[PDB]
DNA sequence: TCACCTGAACCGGTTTCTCACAGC
DNA sequence: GCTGTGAGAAAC
RNA sequence: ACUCGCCUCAGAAGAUAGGGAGAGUAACGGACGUAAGCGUCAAGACCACCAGAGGGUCACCGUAGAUGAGUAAUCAUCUGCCCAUCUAUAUGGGUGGUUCCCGGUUCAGGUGAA
C-alpha cells in the first residue's frame, strides 16, 4: 500500500548550493565508512588465510573470533549507528576545534594541512545530521548487500564487493525521514528563510513543497494529487532527493491507509 | 571520465533532550 | 520581557 | 515570399515560443567562436537593487458569477450551466473538464560520445 510521488524541482541558486553541499556530505561519509570496513575486512581475511594454512577448522576458531571481538577493536565490523558515535562525532569536534582556533591569529596550514585531509576548511559539523547519517545508511546497506550475496541469502549472481564513490561517476541522492517538517499545501514555512521575512506563514497553492532545513521549493508538477490523496487517510512518510545530469528530483514516499 | 540503459534481488527510520524563540 | 512552538543535535 | 526539421525552454506523450538552417516555385543538418577539444548563447508577463545581476507567478485545469490572500501576476474556496464519465432499483446520485506516471538503494554487464 506504498506509493511514490516524484516531482522535478525548480530550485534557486541558494538552494542548489545547499543541495550540492548535502550530496557531497553524504558521499564523504559513505567513503569514510567503506574505507574503514574495507581495511578491517582485509585484516580479517589475511588472518583467516594464515590460520587456515595450518589446517585449522573454522568452527573451532569461530569461538576464538567471538572472544576476539571483545578483545581487539580492529576485529569487529560496524553498522550505521556505532560508526556515528565512536568515530563520526570525534572528527566533528575536531573540525569544530579547527574552526574556533583558526580565528585566534594562528596559522591555518599547521592546524589544517591539505595533504592528509582534502578539505580547504573544516566542515563536518555544520552539515545537517540527517544528511550525514544518510551516507551511513547507504554504506551499511551496501556492505549488507555484499555479505548477503556471499553467505547464503541473496539468490542471484555474486554481488561484487563494495566500491568507492567518486564525483561524477556515481549517483547523487539522500533520504530524509519523518517526523521532521515536510509536506505539500497546508504546511507552514520555516522561521528565518527569506520568504518567511516577507511574511508568508502557510502554503496556499499547489506548486510548493516543504523540505526540512532547505525551506520551501517550487515544483514543475502539481501537488494536487498528493494533497487530495493526503486528505484521504494518507500521510507523508519520507522524502528522497536525487540528481540526474543537471536536474534535481524529489520523491515523496506516501503510505495510504 | 561522464552517461546511459538491462538486470537480479529486496525493500519503503524512532526518540529524547536542549534551546532560542516573535511577538507581543 | 518572557515563554509553549518550533528547530535541531545526538544516540541508536 | 510560402511548406518540411536538426538541437533547445515548457515533469513524460498531444497543443504554443526561442539560434540558426535548409529546398523549391519532402529529403537533408544543431550554432559562435577559440582534427579536435573546451568554453559560451538560444521560453514570454509583474514588483524590486544599482544596461545587467538576484528574488516571487504561470507556460495543466470548459463557460458564468461571489467571496477572500496578494502593492501585483496569479492562485484558492463555494454557487451556477454544458459535456464526458460511471454507479443501484425513466430514475436518482458522484466524478472530473486534452491522456499516463511506484519508486528506492548496490553490484555487474553492454554500448556510447569523449
Apex A22 CA angle, A16 and A24, nearest 5: 105
Q: How far apart are CA A217 and CA A211, in angstroms?
A: 7
Residue A225 to residue A163: CA distance in whole angstroms:
39
Sign of CA dihedral A112, A21, A24, A169: negative
Q: What letter does residue A57 receive in the DSSP assignment?
A: -
Q: What is the DSSP string of A178-239?
A: TTSSEESSS-B--TTSHHHHHT--B--SSS-EEEGGGEEE-BSS-SHHHHHHHTTT-EEEEE
Residues 14-73 of A with CB under 7 A from strand C: none
Domain ranges of chain A: 2-255
| Cell triple for A136 | 551511513
Helix (H, G, I), strand (E, B) or coil at A166: coil
Of A171, A145, A142, nearest in space to A156 by CA: A145
Strand B proximal to A24 Cβ, under 7 A: no
**Angle (CA) A190 A242 A164, round 5°:** 120
* Bases on strand C under 7 Å from any protein CB: 6-12
Work out the burial of residue A45: count CB atoms within 10 Å of its CB; fewer than 13 is exposed, 13-18 middle, 19 or more buried: exposed
Exposure string of A206-230, with b = 16+ CB inside 10 Å and e = fewer, is: bbbbbbbebbbbebebebeebbeeb
The structure's method of determination equals cryo-EM
Beta-carbon neighbour count of residue A167 at 10 Å?
Answer: 9
- 8 Å CB contact between A137 and A175: yes
The residue assigned the cell 566542515 is A123
Residue A157 Cα distances to A88, A139, A148, A153, angstroms: 34, 20, 11, 11
List the grid coordinates of A97: 576545534
Q: Which nucleotide is nearest to A26 (CA to C1')?
A: D105
Residue with cell 515536510: A182
Strand C within 7 A of A118 CB = no
Amino acid at each position: 500500500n506504498l506509493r511514490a510521488y516524484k516531482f522535478r524541482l525548480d530550485p534557486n541558486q541558494a538552494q542548489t548550493t545547499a543541495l550540492y553541499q548535502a550530496v557531497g556530505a553524504a558521499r564523504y561519509t559513505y567513503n569514510m565508512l567503506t574505507a574503514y570496513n574495507l581495511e578491517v575486512n582485509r585484516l580479517r581475511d589475511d588472518y583467516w588465510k594464515r590460520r587456515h594454512d595450518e589446517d585449522i577448522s573454522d568452527a573451532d576458531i569461530k569461538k576464538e573470533l567471538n572472544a576476539l571481538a571483545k578483545e581487539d577493536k580492529r576485529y569487529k565490523q560496524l553498522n550505521y549507528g556505532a560508526f556515528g558515535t565512536q568515530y563520526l562525532t570525534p572528527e566533528k569536534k575536531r573540525h569544530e576545534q579547527a574552526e574556533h582556533r583558526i580565528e585566534n591569529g594562528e596559522d591555518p596550514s599547521v592546524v589544517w594541512n591539505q595533504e592528509t585531509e582534502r578539505s580547504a576548511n573544516p566542515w563536518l559539523h555544520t552539515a545537517n545530521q540527517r544528511v550525514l547519517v544518510s551516507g551511513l545508511q547507504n554504506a551499511s546497506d551496501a556492505w549488507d548487500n555484499f555479505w548477503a550475496s556471499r553467505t547464503g541469502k541473496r539468490a542471484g549472481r555474486l554481488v561484487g564487493t563494495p566500491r568507492f564513490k567518486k564525483k561524477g561517476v556515481s549517483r547523487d541522492s539522500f533520504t530524509v525521514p519523518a517526523p521532521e517538517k515536510m509536506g505539500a499545501y497546508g504546511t507552514a514555512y520555516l522561521r528565518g528563510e527569506p520568504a518567511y521575512k516577507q511574511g508568508r506563514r502557510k502554503i496556499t497553492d499547489y506548486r510548493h513543497v516543504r523540505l526540512s532545513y532547505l525551506g520551501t521549493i517550487r515544483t514543475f508538477n502539481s501537488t494536487k494529487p498528493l494533497v487530495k490523496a493526503v486528505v484521504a487517510g494518507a500521510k507523508i512518510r519520507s522524502y528522497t532527493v536525487s540528481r540526474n545530469a543537471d536536474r534535481w528530483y524529489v520523491s515523496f514516499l506516501v503510505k495510504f491507509s
